[PDB]
Amino acid sequence: AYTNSFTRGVYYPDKVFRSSVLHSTQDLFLPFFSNVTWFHAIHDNPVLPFNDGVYFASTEKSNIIRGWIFGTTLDSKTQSLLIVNNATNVVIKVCEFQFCNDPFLGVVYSSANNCTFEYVSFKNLREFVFKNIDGYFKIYSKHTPINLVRDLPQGFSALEPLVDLPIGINITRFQTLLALHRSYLTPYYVGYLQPRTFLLKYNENGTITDAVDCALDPLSETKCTLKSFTV
Amino acid sequence: EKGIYQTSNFRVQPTESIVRFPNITNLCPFGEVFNATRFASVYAWNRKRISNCVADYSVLYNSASFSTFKCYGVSPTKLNDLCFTNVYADSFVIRGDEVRQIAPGQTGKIADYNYKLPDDFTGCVIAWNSNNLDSKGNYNYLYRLFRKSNLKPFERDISTEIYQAGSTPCNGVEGFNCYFPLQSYGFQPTNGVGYQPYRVVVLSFELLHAPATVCGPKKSTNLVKNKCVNFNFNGLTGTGVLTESNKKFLPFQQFGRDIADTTDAVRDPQTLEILDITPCSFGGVSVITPGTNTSNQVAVLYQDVNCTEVPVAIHADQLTPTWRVYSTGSNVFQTRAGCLIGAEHVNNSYECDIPIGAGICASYQTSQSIIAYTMSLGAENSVAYSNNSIAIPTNFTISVTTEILPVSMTKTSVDCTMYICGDSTEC
Amino acid sequence: AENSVAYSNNSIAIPTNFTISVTTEILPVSMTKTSVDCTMYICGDSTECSNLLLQYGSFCTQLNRALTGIAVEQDKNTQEVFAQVKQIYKTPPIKDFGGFNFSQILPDPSKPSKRSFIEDLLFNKVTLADAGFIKQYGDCLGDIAARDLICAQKFNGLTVLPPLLTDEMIAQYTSALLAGTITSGWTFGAGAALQIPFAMQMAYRFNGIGVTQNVLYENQKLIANQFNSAIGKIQDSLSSTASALGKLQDVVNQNAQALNTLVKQLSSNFGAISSVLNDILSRLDPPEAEVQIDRLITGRLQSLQTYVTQQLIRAAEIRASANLAATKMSECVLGQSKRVDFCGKGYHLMSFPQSAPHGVVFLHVTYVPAQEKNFTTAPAICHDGKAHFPRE
Amino acid sequence: GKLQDVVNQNAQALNTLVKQLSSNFGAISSVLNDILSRLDPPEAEVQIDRLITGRLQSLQTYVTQQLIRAAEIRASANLAATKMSECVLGQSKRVDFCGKGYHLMSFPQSAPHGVVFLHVTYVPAQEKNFTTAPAICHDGKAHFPRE
Amino acid sequence: GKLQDVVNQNAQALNTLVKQLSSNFGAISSVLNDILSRLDPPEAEVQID
Ligand SMILES: *[C@@H]1O[C@H](CO)[C@@H](O[C@@H]2O[C@H](CO)[C@@H](O)[C@H](O)[C@H]2NC(C)=O)[C@H](O)[C@H]1NC(C)=O
Ligand SMILES: *[C@@H]1O[C@H](CO)[C@@H](O[C@@H]2O[C@H](CO)[C@@H](O)[C@H](O)[C@H]2NC(C)=O)[C@H](O)[C@H]1NC(C)=O
Ligand SMILES: *[C@@H]1O[C@H](CO)[C@@H](O[C@@H]2O[C@H](CO)[C@@H](O)[C@H](O)[C@H]2NC(C)=O)[C@H](O)[C@H]1NC(C)=O
Ligand SMILES: *[C@@H]1O[C@H](CO)[C@@H](O[C@@H]2O[C@H](CO)[C@@H](O)[C@H](O)[C@H]2NC(C)=O)[C@H](O)[C@H]1NC(C)=O
Ligand SMILES: *[C@@H]1O[C@H](CO)[C@@H](O[C@@H]2O[C@H](CO)[C@@H](O)[C@H](O)[C@H]2NC(C)=O)[C@H](O)[C@H]1NC(C)=O
Ligand SMILES: *[C@@H]1O[C@H](CO)[C@@H](O)[C@H](O)[C@H]1NC(C)=O
Ligand SMILES: *[C@@H]1O[C@H](CO)[C@@H](O)[C@H](O)[C@H]1NC(C)=O
Ligand SMILES: *[C@@H]1O[C@H](CO)[C@@H](O)[C@H](O)[C@H]1NC(C)=O
Ligand SMILES: *[C@@H]1O[C@H](CO)[C@@H](O)[C@H](O)[C@H]1NC(C)=O
Ligand SMILES: *[C@@H]1O[C@H](CO)[C@@H](O)[C@H](O)[C@H]1NC(C)=O
Ligand SMILES: *[C@@H]1O[C@H](CO)[C@@H](O)[C@H](O)[C@H]1NC(C)=O
Ligand SMILES: *[C@@H]1O[C@H](CO)[C@@H](O)[C@H](O)[C@H]1NC(C)=O
Ligand SMILES: *[C@@H]1O[C@H](CO)[C@@H](O)[C@H](O)[C@H]1NC(C)=O
Ligand SMILES: *[C@@H]1O[C@H](CO)[C@@H](O)[C@H](O)[C@H]1NC(C)=O
């Protein structure tokens, strides 16, 4: 289960406007031409780690995927997260439960005891970057439409963030939850970030037009040390 | 002497001040974290995320209930002009001598074993004595002693598993090389300074952030719309001319910049309006003159500036009335180098006397004024060419001309030690 | 290619035909004049730093004096190449030059400018697209749809001054040199212009390289056709997608590469807490701020000094090629040169100048010998006890 | 003018080098004795090290500009040496090298820090129109002039 | 002699650049490893600069 992702995983790392420049920056991106795992959970939704950060992207049809959980102790021993939707507006609950060994949502098992805070706010794709730094948790997103059914396109897309979360807690692993029709109580793609070095292009009105990965091949190292696109 | 000179800026102006800030009303918990009773211990220090304040700082450090106010990244004076976007107040109570062990880059038993600041730190350290509060022999204050490694900064540890310093797995037994990690403070009222309990608070923030919230008692003013100011926008300041903008920002782009990493476009924190900034010095002023041995007339060239925008760009109304003479008049001429003011443009052509640029020269002509023309390349001529006609000379001239060439120059020599520090043996 | 010459003690080879060859030589003459405001670059609109900068002495009147010397010298470079004669000769209205066709180098009476066809092909080979700062200043002067746009104070004190002689006066000089050379020969560079028919002048230019003058009058139509074909090949080679003016493009590339660095060096902090002056001004008290401001002052002074030193060394080698182009105008165009390979390759006949951006282009017309034949030769001839030697 | 500008620049540089000694570059004073008399050598070593770098930079700027000026003077000494061999010791055919006209002879005259050449040239005047022909046919044959 | 002068100038200009590495310029040592093994990373940034 491995797939090539060409130019996906790009975002706006800062809140500063730049018109018609070629700026370079050193941040946590997904490397170009990488390996993403192909997941289709038809006959599991298992636990996957959180090493630096997680790229998430899915090609959905009628809103099957609801949300995720982030944490590692999973029995209200230490903190954990939960982001779900009630099909109208998004819900953000950082609260401790005991998590099932087959956890999803039913068209359903939560029992909190002690927590900190809470917050509420083939057609198109839902790309998502999850980055956890000291003092925050940022939720970047790219919401683009494509005609291809299963795989990532060759295009370049990078659009504006959504929300930052002042949590200051630790995450080691994570897991995602689905929307099943039945409410049981029984006992999409992923990709990890890496500290690369990127040269980006801003056109007029401050839109990221194309990027260069300065570690992929010697020709891009040449493009990076010349601070240019043409060689 | 006769020529065209480039003058550095010397004209002075009066300058006002503009302040802009969001709509924020409420106060925030500074009235309880400073006079509380239950302060936390050293190994388990408290942490309080602070937001949405107009909280003053002069109410804190001017009140003399503190003994030490060491403040690292910011000067202690201008802590009430800036926004901080998060504040982390921390609380713990230590011995009197270990207040030095809170500083960035220290040692001992606190900075390596209990609580460690980072070296790149921008906050403010507060400490004062509590001899009449936590001294009965009070044994409720504990501190961690041993760890296998050193403390990474801004992290905590709470665990009771005893030390190991040999190779015996001491399973909760206090023999040799295996000891308990936590011991009590001896706080008797019969000790000197350096042993009484002290209430030590530390703050922490980072600046130059976009959606910054925590900022105190600075009154908003209104805009003055294209005059030189000292603006202040959520903490960031600068001197320039505030102009109206057109840049297509995003739902959150708080400010913009150029190649040189300097800000040029800012967002109004009240009206959500974009303001484009532009400096106001205008050094690019050149003075055409003949010799001062001849006259005292001048002309002024304004470099790459349209003629109708001269009095707006040099800020003409705030100058001397002699400098306003050279800003508009009958003598106004538009060249491709800029706007030339003070010279009477004619329709003739001569050879160049003082070069101005892009084909225009200037000379002092006899009623004596300064004129400006387009320079002539030479006399016009036409050779009577035919396909069977020739011209032969019949006489000649012997002419002697002159040519001067430099060959050598002056042979200097410099004593290094006498120039840098003459006859001083300390240097 | 390897080769070998059939040498022997009594054999000679002599050409039987020739070729008229036209070739091209490109020389840089001047470069961009710049000007830097010291106080606006080091600390713009800040009186806390401007009083700290005065403690460093006169380190800015010196930089402005050096840059003004460079910018003044760049106009003397153009004046010593193009302003050789001070009589503007007009081209004759009726053109009968014995079959020679100077249409693509004489000025064009359709357009409002004075450029020819080859000068128009030359003005589009040099571009300003990859240049960073110079293109960004060049878009000020075309930004006509914006009131209140004073952009001398938008680029951190850096400006660009315009040349004294515009692009029309330079073409008006080269047209005068062409119209003097065609209708007068070499006589206008040594006194007053004396007319002479063009075939009678090409005959003496053949006679100057050692060919007698009946050869021109017996092969005049062939020589005229060879000249016109050699001009058409130059126009074809320039009109294509070749990168012909490399020597004039490297000057603009080297000048923009060094001005982008001076702006990119305004974001280094040099050891201070921040590379922005207003953050140090609004986060510290003036007891403890004039260490960080002194660090920034020292770094930005070093950057300006490095820029000015490399500009002086770079202008000292544009002065040399301007002196070379001013020597080639006097000896190749206003005369006929006997120095080998100074004007072209072959035996020199005549030259014509064309103006390019920040430079000049010479079209050297030379004489190349063609297909030869072996013979037998002897030093002298004995007739009656006397040796007879050839005259010429 | 060209021999005067050399003297003017080479005096202006040595005047700027002297006036650079009155700056303090961030120290408390510019006179070294006044720093040494009011401070003990714990904290005089920071003021003196602030002055030493600021004076080394002035010296280096002076020497770097003098090298470029000497490289410019060498290039005109090499031109005067060529004009002395080709204009004075001979008769040159290079156009406008030894004066405007046709060259006859030249004479040198020494000047302060330089040299002055007086070029004697031939200039034609008082023209007259004529009518010309390339050749002349006599007996079916063409006749061309010798010179 | 003219061909030997160029070699004699280039070799001297390369020797001076190497010999300038044994100066401290106002620090405590001309060796980076001594400053990095004797002092702390808060303090060594003023003797390395
Ligand atoms: C923050 O998260 C990391 C990653 O899980 C923690 O490192 C783990 O610490 C536990 C406790 O000893 C070990 O059992 C794991 O093996 C560690 N994992 C890795 C990858 O090193 C880290 O200790 C956490 N920090 C806290 C909780 O303060
Ligand atoms: C040689 O003949 C030509 C043609 O007659 C002379 O050129 C004329 O000079 C007069 C002088 O005022 C002008 O008014 C005419 O317009 C010229 N004619 C043309 C066609 O240009 C020329 O001057 C004569 N040479 C001499 C030395 O007198
Ligand atoms: C050539 O020019 C010279 C002067 O340049 C002429 O000599 C002049 O002749 C007139 C008439 O006798 C005198 O009035 C002048 O005083 C003479 N000048 C000098 C300097 O001697 C000479 O006549 C001219 N030759 C021709 C053929 O015209
Ligand atoms: C000398 O060379 C020219 C060309 O350089 C020759 O002219 C060519 O002659 C052939 C045959 O008559 C034609 O096909 C070409 O078109 C001619 N070219 C041109 C440019 O005219 C000429 O014949 C040669 N003469 C001798 C004696 O060999
Ligand atoms: C000189 O050469 C040019 C280039 O071939 C000739 O110009 C062309 O001549 C043809 C012939 O009528 C015209 O159809 C073209 O329009 C001309 N081109 C241009 C750009 O003008 C020119 O005719 C030649 N000169 C002579 C006297 O024949
Ligand atoms: C990705 O997976 C392929 C096989 O599916 C493997 O050959 C390659 O080494 C992997 N890693 C990359 C491309 O970095
Ligand atoms: C939260 O409350 C529970 C009681 O339900 C308690 O067991 C737990 O220790 C508390 N956690 C804290 C105070 O961090
Ligand atoms: C960028 O701005 C221009 C106006 O200058 C506009 O025409 C164009 O649509 C904008 N690009 C976008 C919105 O992607
Ligand atoms: C903030 O206050 C200003 C001035 O009263 C007002 O114009 C603006 O609408 C207010 N904004 C919000 C979000 O309340
Ligand atoms: C803290 O409490 C004391 C009571 O002893 C009171 O005097 C003091 O004013 C309080 N401080 C603040 C900031 O309210
Ligand atoms: C000024 O000009 C006068 C002529 O009126 C002349 O006598 C005098 O020498 C000049 N002085 C200077 C310093 O040029
Ligand atoms: C300067 O402003 C005037 C006023 O409208 C305008 O007519 C003129 O074209 C402007 N100059 C240039 C060079 O655009
Ligand atoms: C001078 O030229 C301007 C335009 O070029 C014209 O308006 C004016 O009438 C002319 N004046 C004279 C005296 O020729
Ligand atoms: C002259 O003769 C030699 C040998 O006889 C021959 O190799 C050479 O090609 C001849 N030269 C020409 C121009 O044909």
From Swiss-Prot, chain A:
Q: What does the UniProt entry list as the effect of changing residue 47 to A?
A: In strain: Omicron/XBB.1.5, Omicron/EG.5.1
According to the entry, every stretch annotated as the BetaCoV S1-NTD domain falls at: 1-226
- Give the consequence of mutating residue 85 to Q: Partial loss of biliverdin affinity
Glycan-linked positions: 35, 86, 114, 170, 205
The observed outcome of changing residue 126 to S is: In strain: Gamma/P.1
UniProt superkingdom = Viruses
Question: Where in this protein does the record put region Putative superantigen?
Answer: 203-224
Cystine pairings recorded for this chain: 95-115, 214-224
What result is annotated for mutating residue 106 to D?
A: In strain: Kappa/B.1.617.1, Omicron/BA.2, Omicron/BA.2.12.1, Omicron/BA.2.75, Omicron/BA.4, Omicron/BA.5, Omicron/BQ.1.1, Omicron/XBB.1.5, Omicron/EG.5.1
Summarize subunit and interaction data from the UniProt record for this chain.
Binds to host ACE2. RBD also interacts with the N-linked glycan on 'Asn-90' of ACE2. Cleavage of S generates a polybasic C-terminal sequence on S1 that binds to host Neuropilin-1 (NRP1) and Neuropilin-2 (NRP2) receptors. Interacts with host integrin alpha-5/beta-1 (ITGA5:ITGB1) and with ACE2 in complex with integrin alpha-5/beta-1 (ITGA5:ITGB1). May interact via cytoplasmic c-terminus with M protein. May interact (via N-terminus) with host bilirubin and biliverdin, thereby preventing antibody binding to the SARS-CoV-2 spike NTD via an allosteric mechanism.
Role this protein plays: Attaches the virion to the cell membrane by interacting with host receptor, initiating the infection. The major receptor is host ACE2. When S2/S2' has been cleaved, binding to the receptor triggers direct fusion at the cell membrane. When S2/S2' has not been cleaved, binding to the receptor results in internalization of the virus by endocytosis using host TFRC and GRM2 and leading to fusion of the virion membrane with the host endosomal membrane. Alternatively, may use NRP1/NRP2 and integrin as entry receptors.
Record-given protein name = Spike protein S1
Q: Which organism is it from?
A: Severe acute respiratory syndrome coronavirus 2 (2019-nCoV)
Q: Which gene encodes it?
A: S
Q: Report which part of the complete sequence is shown.
A: 27 to 308 of 1273
From Swiss-Prot, chain D:
In UniProt terms, what is the effect of altering residue 37 to A? In strain: Alpha/B.1.1.7
What changing residue 36 to F does, per the record, is:
In strain: Omicron/BA.1
Q: Which residues are glycosylated?
A: 129
Name the cystine pairs: 87-98
- Coiled coil spans: 4-48
Q: What task does this protein carry out?
A: Subunit of the fusion protein that is processed upon entry into the host cell. Mediates fusion of the virion and cellular membranes by functioning as a class I viral fusion protein. Contains a viral fusion peptide that is unmasked after S2 cleavage. This cleavage can occur at the cell membrane by host TMPRSS2 or during endocytosis by host CSTL. In either case, this triggers an extensive and irreversible conformational change that leads to fusion of the viral envelope with the cellular cytoplasmic membrane, releasing viral genomic RNA into the host cell cytoplasm.
Q: What is this protein called?
A: Spike protein S2'
| Source organism of this protein record | Severe acute respiratory syndrome coronavirus 2
The gene from which this protein is expressed is S
Included range, full protein = 946 to 1092 of 1273
